[PDB]
């Protein structure tokens, strides 16, 4: 990989080869071509899963959701050429993306008829049926989470970052909780480090100790961050991470900060989050022992929009941990209001 | 501006100051903030236009349609505080974007009440009324093109190419048929030249003479390319161009090709086009004096999908002119089939 980079701060132009980690966040709203195994093979897998008691799919990320959106029409056009009375319906994702206990099976025969080569130009669209194979909608009543497949695919070849490239996936044979490592990039250089994927951009910096700096999340995954793509994974306890392990948080000393424990009850229902260590507008935080214990994360404004003025923590360090969302600020589990009762505030109802 | 550039095919780099022209086509489906004048001034302009009999707006480009979509909700929340019984309705664009004979008036007093600073965080949505001010759509029956305003805005400042930046617009006092020069970039370097804006990318090269090489249009405008942004404007015929002058084609010797005249009757109904000088698959063109004369552009496949194999023309130069669209190839007005009658083919019904 030959590459040149420039630092416009003073002047630093450099060229050569090596490993380059780019900021690929939100690589689902771009134009790509998606190629699951094969139309006949994927149709056979869906038919076998349906006959074996799997109702639908809970997606790991946004990219799988977009892939299903892309292949829905052809998957329905095939699988009626084979007489199967089934229809795939794709919905929109909700955060967080809860884990599913089933997987898609690998078929050994592959449906006949149909055609090859995802991307047929002209075909007759399929009429709707009575049986629906749903993918991540408001559909938990017609079949529960316990009968859904999750984390079934593997990326084999991709060109993310260049438009109009093809992405090649495959139904996996094994059972795993790991996130797909083909789209993960980690890098450290001097006093700064990055843990990144298609939906996560996590920064850490070398202070007196290594600590978390800021994080940008566009999705809330529930897979596990692989250790081959993680820095300093030894001598680390799960109780002192910041991003919980069950929310695809890395198991690293770079995922820590003094005075804070794992944020199991943050505002994980949000569409998009930023994690910063900075006071929100109109608020001040004071360290004192007489303050309350940990609890659910609290919004800095009430339902009517009034800003709470003064907050406390028992043993935290400045600046305070905060979450930035579309509806306003949230504080960490350690930061509680000094005078306002906690029953008058908006809180988080989600546990990781 | 200060910049650095690299060409990997020759492995060279270069840094310095100058004028940089980028490929910014389809820079409307990105995230930008739009500020059309002031919430109150624009409401006053719309109200006065409605009182003067202007039914609606015909857009100049995709950017203006996106701006109207962005500001519609606030423009309806205001103009209800003032008791005006008017609702803005915004639809989709169709090609080509025909010219309108009216303009928006510049208000002199500005609506009272209302608020400042486009982008108010919270407001009450307005109720739909009986009188609709229609921005483009399928609404030519409810008010014809003759009562529509067109090309009423001028860009003052923008940050196109940098996301989440602001675009500042104003309602122009004058009357003109010229496209906005604030977003036009033209360059020539050695034997290659570019004429570009937010929707056009037109390339020319130095052969034995200067000639058109390829063009990429994602929209068909009807404004006029300004001569201040055009190379080699003297001693040129308006009937020797390729892209017609009434379709925002530059009046340049870089918009010519030997043996071809202006394509008044091309396939200008497409969503986006690519102008290429190359034969389409399965077809061959021959230069013969016994062939037919110019006419509307014809599609290379019939309605049932059959490819026509043999085409002729009188005084062409090879390779032949062709248009690449979503439904397939079209040939230039000079190229006619040899054996197939012209009545058996799909033709173009649009005249510039």
């Amino acid at each position, epitope marked *: 990989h030959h590459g040149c980079s420039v630092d416009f701060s003073k002047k630093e132009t450099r060229c050569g080869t090596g490993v380059f980690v780019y900021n690929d966040v939100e690589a689902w709203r771009d134009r790509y071509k998606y190629h699951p195994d094969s139309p006949r093979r994927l149709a056979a897998a869906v038919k076998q899963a349906w006959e074996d008691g799997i109702c639908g799919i809970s997606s790991v990320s946004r990219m799988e959701n977009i892939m299903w959106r892309s292949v829905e029409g052809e998957l329905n056009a095939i699988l009626e050429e084979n007489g199967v009375q089934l229809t795939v319906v794709v919905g929109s994702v909700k955060n967080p993306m809860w884990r599913g206990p089933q997987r898609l099976p690998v078929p050994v025969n592959e449906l006949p008829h149909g055609w090859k080569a995802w991307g047929k130009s002209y075909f007759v669209r399929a009429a709707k049926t009575n049986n629906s194979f749903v993918v991540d909608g*408001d559909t938990l*009543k017609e079949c529960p989470l316990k009968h859904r497949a999750w984390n079934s695919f593997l990326v084999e070849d991709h060109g993310f970052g260049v438009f109009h490239t093809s992405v090649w996936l495959k139904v996996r044979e094994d059972y795993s909780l790991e996130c797909d490592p083909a789209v993960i990039g980690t890098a450290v250089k001097g006093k700064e480090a990055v843990h990144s994927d298609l939906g996560y951009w996590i920064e850490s910096e070398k202070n007196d100790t290594w600590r978390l700096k800021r994080a940008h999340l566009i999705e809330m995954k529930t897979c596990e961050w692989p250790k081959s793509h993680t820095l300093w994974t030894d001598g680390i306890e799960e109780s002192d991470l910041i991003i919980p392990k069950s929310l695809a948080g890395p198991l690293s000393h770079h995922n820590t900060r003094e005075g804070y424990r794992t944020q199991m009850k943050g505002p994980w*229902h949000s569409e998009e989050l930023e994690i910063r260590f900075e006071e929100c507008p109109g608020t001040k935080v004071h360290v004192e022992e007489t303050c309350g214990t940990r609890g659910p994360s609290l919004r800095s*404004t*009430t*339902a*009517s*929009g*009034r800003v709470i003025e003064e907050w406390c923590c028992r043993e935290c360090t400045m600046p305070p941990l905060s979450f930035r969302a*579309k*509806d*306003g600020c949230w504080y960490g589990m350690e930061i509680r209001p000094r005078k306002e009762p906690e*029953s*008058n505030l*908006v*809180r*988080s*109802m*989600v546990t990781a | 501006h200060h910049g650095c550039s690299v060409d990997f095919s020759k492995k060279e780099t270069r840094c310095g100051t100058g004028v940089f022209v980028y490929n910014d086509v389809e820079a409307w489906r990105d995230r930008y903030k739009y500020h059309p004048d002031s919430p109150r001034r624009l409401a006053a302009a719309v109200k006065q236009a409605w009182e003067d009999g202007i039914c609606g707006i015909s857009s100049v480009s995709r950017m203006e349609n996106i701006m109207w979509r962005s500001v519609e909700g606030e423009l309806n*929340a205001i103009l*209800e*505080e003032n008791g005006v019984q008017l609702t803005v309705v915004v639809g989709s664009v169709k090609n080509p974007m025909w010219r309108g004979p009216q303009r928006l008036p510049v208000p002199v007093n500005e609506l009272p009440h209302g608020w400042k600073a486009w982008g108010k*965080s*919270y407001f*009450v949505r*307005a*109720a*739909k009324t009986n009188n609709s001010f229609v921005v483009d759509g399928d609404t030519l029956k409810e008010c014809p093109l003759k009562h529509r305003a067109w090309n009423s805005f001028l860009v003052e400042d923008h940050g196109f190419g940098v996301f989440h930046t602001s675009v500042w617009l104003k309602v122009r006092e004058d009357y003109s048929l010229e496209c906005d020069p604030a977003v036009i970039g033209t360059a020539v370097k050695g034997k290659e030249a570019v004429h570009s804006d937010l929707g056009y990318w037109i390339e020319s090269e130095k052969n034995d003479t200067w000639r058109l090489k390829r063009a990429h249009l994602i929209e068909m405008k009807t404004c006029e390319w300004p001569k201040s942004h055009t190379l080699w404007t003297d001693g040129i015929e308006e009937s020797d161009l390729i892209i017609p002058k009434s379709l925002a084609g530059p009046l340049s010797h870089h918009n010519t090709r030997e043996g071809y005249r202006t394509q008044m009757k091309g396939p200008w109904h497409s969503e986006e086009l690519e102008i290429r000088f190359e034969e389409c698959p399965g077809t061959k063109v021959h230069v013969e004096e016994t062939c037919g004369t110019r006419g509307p552009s014809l599609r290379s496949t019939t309605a049932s999908g059959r490819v026509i194999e043999e085409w002729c023309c009188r005084e062409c130069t090879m390779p032949p002119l062709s248009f690449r669209a979503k439904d397939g190839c079209w040939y230039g007005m000079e190229i006619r089939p040899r054996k197939e009658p012209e009545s058996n083919l799909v033709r173009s019904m649009v005249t510039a």
Partner: antibody, heavy 120, light 108 residues
Framework: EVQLLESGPGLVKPSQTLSLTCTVS??????????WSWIRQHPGKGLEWIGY???????YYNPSLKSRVAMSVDTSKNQFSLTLSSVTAADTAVYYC????????????WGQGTLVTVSS | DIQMTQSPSSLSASVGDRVTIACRAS??????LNWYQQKPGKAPKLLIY???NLQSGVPSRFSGSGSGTDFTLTISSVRPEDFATYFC?????????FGQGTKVDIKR
């Protein structure tokens, strides 16, 4: 152009459970920037606020109703509901459902109201 | 928990004169006050929010002022259609509370 329509039983025997439903038209009950409340008006007396609920799950209940109320959101039918247990002859009132804008004080649109009588 | 007091409890006025209603709060609510109007057999409707800010579609003869603990709603020129009940609401801290209401009678 949003309309709120509340319904429920017209008469409730004492010591049973009161159940009401508000149906939302012209919008959706999953939009982010709103929350939903119930208000009751005693005959001849003044208005009384019951509580609110977000689609995420956060709620507030009036301490005056001592752990007797419950609110839920049903996305499939596009509605939210109220449940008041252990009724008494003091619960006779008109009941309104409202939709408020988040962080805009209490800018709200109320429903038409339903009368509930507790007798036999 | 925050008690809201409205005075006078009722009043009669002629078409053209001025009506003034005062709301008092048991503690300082900064500017989190709303005003409501209820005609018989109809749901209460929000006229003014945040002390002064007026809702769209509401005549300009309604106005509001105040801060802290005292507040006022004035009708600069009474019209026939102004026969209704008026309430004051605070939204400073939940639970939200209303005043007892003021009935404005149109006097011929």
């Amino acid at each position: 152009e949003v309309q709120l329509l509340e319904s429920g039983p017209g008469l409730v025997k004492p010591s049973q459970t009161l159940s009401l439903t508000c149906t939302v038209s012209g919008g959706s009950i999953s939009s982010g920037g709103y929350y939903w409340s119930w208000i009751r008006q005693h005959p001849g007396k003044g208005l009384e606020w019951i509580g609110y609920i977000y689609y995420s799950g956060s709620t507030y209940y009036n301490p005056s109703l001592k752990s007797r109320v419950a609110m839920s959101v049903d996305t499939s039918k596009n509605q939210f509901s109220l449940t008041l247990s252990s009724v008494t002859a003091a619960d006779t009132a008109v009941y309104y459902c409202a939709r408020a804008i988040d962080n805009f004080y209490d800018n709200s649109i109320w429903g038409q109201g339903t009368l509930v009588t507790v007798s036999s | 928990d925050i008690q809201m007091t409205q005075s006078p409890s009722s009043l009669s006025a002629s078409v053209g004169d001025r009506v003034t209603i005062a709301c008092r709060a048991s503690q300082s609510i900064t500017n989190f006050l709303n005003w409501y109007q209820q005609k018989p057999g109809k749901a209460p409707k929000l006229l003014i929010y945040a002390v002064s800010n007026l809702q769209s579609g509401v005549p300009s003869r309604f106005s509001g002022s105040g801060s802290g603990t005292d507040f006022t709603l004035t009708i600069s020129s009474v019209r026939p259609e102004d026969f209704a009940t008026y309430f004051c609401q605070q939204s400073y801290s939940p639970p939200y509370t209303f005043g007892q209401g003021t009935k404005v009678d149109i006097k011929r």
